Amino acid sequence: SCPVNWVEHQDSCYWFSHSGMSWAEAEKYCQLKNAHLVVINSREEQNFVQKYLGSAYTWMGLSDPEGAWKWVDGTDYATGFQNWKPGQPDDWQGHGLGGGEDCAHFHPDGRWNDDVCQRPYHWVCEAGL
Amino acid sequence: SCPVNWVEHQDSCYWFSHSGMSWAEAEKYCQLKNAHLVVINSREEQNFVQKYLGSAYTWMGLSDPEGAWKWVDGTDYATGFQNWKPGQPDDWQGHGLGGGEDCAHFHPDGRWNDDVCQRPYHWVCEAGL
Numbered sequence: 256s257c258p259v260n261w262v263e264h265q266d267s268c269y270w271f272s273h274s275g276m277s278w279a280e281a282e283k284y285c286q287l288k289n290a291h292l293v294v295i296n297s298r299e300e301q302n303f304v305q306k307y308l309g310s311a312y313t314w315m316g317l318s319d320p321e322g323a324w325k326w327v328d329g330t331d332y333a334t335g336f337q338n339w340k341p342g343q344p345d346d347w348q349g350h351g352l353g354g355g356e357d358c359a360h361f362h363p364d365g366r367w368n369d370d371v372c373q374r375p376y377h378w379v380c381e382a383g384l
Numbered sequence: 385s386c387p388v389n390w391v392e393h394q395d396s397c398y399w400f401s402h403s404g405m406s407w408a409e410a411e412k413y414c415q416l417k418n419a420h421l422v423v424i425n426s427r428e429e430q431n432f433v434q435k436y437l438g439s440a441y442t443w444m445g446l447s448d449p450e451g452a453w454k455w456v457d458g459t460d461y462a463t464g465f466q467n468w469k470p471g472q473p474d475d476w477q478g479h480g481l482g483g484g485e486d487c488a489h490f491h492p493d494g495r496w497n498d499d500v501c502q503r504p505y506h507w508v509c510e511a512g513l
């Protein structure tokens with residue numbers, strides 16, 4: 256069903272990176288593979304992804320550069336699954352890198368934070384069977 | 385002599401960022417201003433730059449992607465000024481982001497480290513009068 260190096264779970268294929276990239280380079284990489292940064296639709300999909308995280312900050316397909324949180328495939332954010340860290344999202348500016356925080360990632364426990372999109376983090380691609 | 389927002393010191397003009405960018409985006413930015421990432425030629429230039437650092441990791445124009453350390457303007461590395469942190473450079477791979485470390489930055493004390501080029505750090509441009 257899934258191509259080599261991809262993992263099958265509940266009608267999606269997943270590819271976990273062994274490397275780090277900015278959020279934009281990660282989304283380009285996934286697009287070139289006819290896939291998207293992982294969209295988390297359910298508690299079950301969250302549990303599956305968080306147990307195979309490579310013990311590092313990992314990008315997912317969730318961003319708010321134009322003010323409102325959006326999933327890359329158009330899944331609705333407000334009525335969808337959410338799993339933020341206490342205090343997140345916060346659009347923090349105190350990194351002093353310019354702007355706030357517009358890209359979401361997993362912590363190792365699977366809770367979400369908003370961070371600076373330019374940061375090189377691991378990523379997960381998702382595609383259909 | 386120097387354009388507005390630039391600082392004059394000993395026949396160069398310097399521009400210090402209030403923001404962060406990958407090493408490649410920083411070098412592009414400096415190139416667009418008809419300048420280069422700062423090359424450190426002397427102890428005196430090191431002292432001037434380190435006392436105006438914005439209390440954060442800051443890119444300089446020094447990289448070794450093709451195996452040997454090079455300054456962006458062709459200043460010779462081996463016979464030039466060096467100011468590495470104890471243990472640096474180390475081309476560390478234990479970040480698990482892929483590859484080693486191919487781009488040099490200042491610590492706040494002005495000592496140099498090699499790090500992952502994709503990291504968003506502050507930068508300094510240098511040009512002639």
Ligand SMILES: CS[C@H]1C[C@H](CO)[C@H](O)[C@H](O)[C@H]1NC(C)=O
Pocket residue numbers: 312343345347356368369370
């Ligand atoms: C100290 S970094 C941590 C908390 C920040 C606010 O104090 C901010 O939200 C940032 O996004 C957070 N970074 C991580 C990796 O969670």
Ligand SMILES: CS[C@H]1C[C@H](CO)[C@H](O)[C@H](O)[C@H]1NC(C)=O
Pocket residue numbers: 441472474476485497498499
């Ligand atoms: C813990 S990060 C620090 C030491 C590393 C080797 O243990 C490596 O050289 C890395 O480049 C260093 N990072 C900084 C910011 O100096």
Ligand SMILES: [Ca+2]
Pocket residue numbers: 267293294295296300381
């Ligand atoms: Ca999904």
Ligand SMILES: [Ca+2]
Pocket residue numbers: 319320346355356357358369
């Ligand atoms: Ca934001």
Ligand SMILES: [Ca+2]
Pocket residue numbers: 343344345346347356368369370
């Ligand atoms: Ca945050």
Ligand SMILES: [Ca+2]
Pocket residue numbers: 396422423424425429510
């Ligand atoms: Ca110089």
Ligand SMILES: [Ca+2]
Pocket residue numbers: 448449475484485486487498
């Ligand atoms: Ca290197």
Ligand SMILES: [Ca+2]
Pocket residue numbers: 472473474475476485497498499
């Ligand atoms: Ca290093």
Ligand SMILES: [Cl-]
Pocket residue numbers: 272273274
């Ligand atoms: Cl990889």
Ligand SMILES: [Cl-]
Pocket residue numbers: 322323324332
């Ligand atoms: Cl929103």
Ligand SMILES: [Cl-]
Pocket residue numbers: 337338339
């Ligand atoms: Cl939540």
Ligand SMILES: [Cl-]
Pocket residue numbers: 346347348349
């Ligand atoms: Cl803030």
Ligand SMILES: [Cl-]
Pocket residue numbers: 362363364365
């Ligand atoms: Cl955690």
Ligand SMILES: [Cl-]
Pocket residue numbers: 354355356357358370371372373
């Ligand atoms: Cl951002």
Ligand SMILES: [Cl-]
Pocket residue numbers: 401402403
């Ligand atoms: Cl700036």
Ligand SMILES: [Cl-]
Pocket residue numbers: 451452453461
């Ligand atoms: Cl060398």
